[PDB]
Structure 1
Amino acid sequence: PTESIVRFPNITNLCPFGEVFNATRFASVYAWNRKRISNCVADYSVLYNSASFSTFKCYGVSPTKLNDLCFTNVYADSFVIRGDEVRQIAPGQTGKIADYNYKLPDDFTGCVIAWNSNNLDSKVGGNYNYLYRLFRKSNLKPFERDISTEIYQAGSTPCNGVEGFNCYFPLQSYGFQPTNGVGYQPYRVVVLSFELLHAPATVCGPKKSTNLVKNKCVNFNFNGLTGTGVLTESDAVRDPQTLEILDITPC
Structure 2
Amino acid sequence: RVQPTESIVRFPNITNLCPFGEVFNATRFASVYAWNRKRISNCVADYSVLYNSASFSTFKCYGVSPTKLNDLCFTNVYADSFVIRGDEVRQIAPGQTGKIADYNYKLPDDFTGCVIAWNSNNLDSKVGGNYNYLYRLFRKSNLKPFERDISTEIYQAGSTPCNGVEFNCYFPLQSYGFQPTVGYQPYRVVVLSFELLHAPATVCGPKKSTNLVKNKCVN
Using the size of structure 1 for normalisation, the TM-score is 0.79
Counterpart Cα distance in 2 of 1:44 and 1:175:
28
Going from structure 1 to structure 2, the CA distance change for 1:176 and 1:195 (only over 3 Å counts) comes to same
**CA shift for structure 1 position 8:** 0.6
**CA shift for structure 1 position 135:** 2.5
Contact 2:130/2:175, CA 8 A, preserved across alignment: no
Q: 1:57 aligns to what SS in structure 2?
A: strand
Percent identity between matched residues is 100
Q: 1:171 aligns to what SS in structure 2?
A: coil
Q: Which of the two has higher C-alpha Rg?
A: 1
Contact 1:136/1:152, CA 8 A, preserved across alignment: no
Moved more, 116-125 or 192-201: 192-201
**CA shift for structure 1 position 214:** 3.4
Counterpart Cα distance in 1 of 2:173 and 2:84:
14
1:230-241 aligned at under 5 Å gives the runs none
Counterpart Cα distance in 2 of 1:185 and 1:175:
4
For residues 30-52 of structure 1, give each alpha carbon's deviation from its aligned partner in whole angstroms, at most 9, with x where no partner exists. 12221010111100112211121
Deviating runs (4+, > 6 A) in structure 1?
none
Counterpart Cα distance in 1 of 2:52 and 2:10:
27
Counterpart Cα distance in 1 of 2:23 and 2:48:
17
Going from structure 1 to structure 2, the CA distance change for 1:214 and 1:32 (only over 3 Å counts) comes to closer
**CA shift for structure 1 position 102:** 1.2
**CA shift for structure 1 position 95:** 1.9
Counterpart Cα distance in 2 of 1:128 and 1:112:
25
| Higher-strand-fraction structure | 1
**CA shift for structure 1 position 88:** 0.2
What is the root-mean-square deviation in Å for CA atoms of aligned residues? 1.8
Going from structure 1 to structure 2, the CA distance change for 1:210 and 1:167 (only over 3 Å counts) comes to same
Q: 1:95 aligns to what SS in structure 2?
A: coil
* Partner in structure 2 of residue 187 of structure 1: 187
**CA shift for structure 1 position 175:** 6.0
Counterpart Cα distance in 2 of 1:74 and 1:155:
39
Counterpart Cα distance in 2 of 1:6 and 1:157:
64
**CA shift for structure 1 position 127:** 4.6
**CA shift for structure 1 position 129:** 1.0
Contact 1:74/1:203, CA 8 A, preserved across alignment: yes
1:38-53 aligned at under 5 Å gives the runs 38-53=41-56
Q: 1:42 aligns to what SS in structure 2?
A: coil
Contact 2:14/2:43, CA 8 A, preserved across alignment: yes
Counterpart Cα distance in 2 of 1:126 and 1:186:
15
Contact 1:76/1:191, CA 8 A, preserved across alignment: yes
Contact 1:152/1:170, CA 8 A, preserved across alignment: no
Going from structure 1 to structure 2, the CA distance change for 1:131 and 1:210 (only over 3 Å counts) comes to same
**CA shift for structure 1 position 155:** 4.7
Using the size of structure 2 for normalisation, the TM-score is 0.90
Going from structure 1 to structure 2, the CA distance change for 1:157 and 1:52 (only over 3 Å counts) comes to closer
Contact 2:83/2:177, CA 8 A, preserved across alignment: no
Counterpart Cα distance in 2 of 1:71 and 1:166:
45
**CA shift for structure 1 position 132:** 1.0
Contact 1:136/1:170, CA 8 A, preserved across alignment: no
Contact 1:150/1:170, CA 8 A, preserved across alignment: no
Counterpart Cα distance in 1 of 2:105 and 2:171:
19
**CA shift for structure 1 position 109:** 0.6
Structure 1 unaligned segments of length 5 or more: list them. 218-251
Contact 1:111/1:192, CA 8 A, preserved across alignment: yes
**CA shift for structure 1 position 114:** 0.5
Ranked by relative contact order (alpha carbons within 8 Å, sequence separation 6 or more), the top structure is 2
Aligned residues: 214
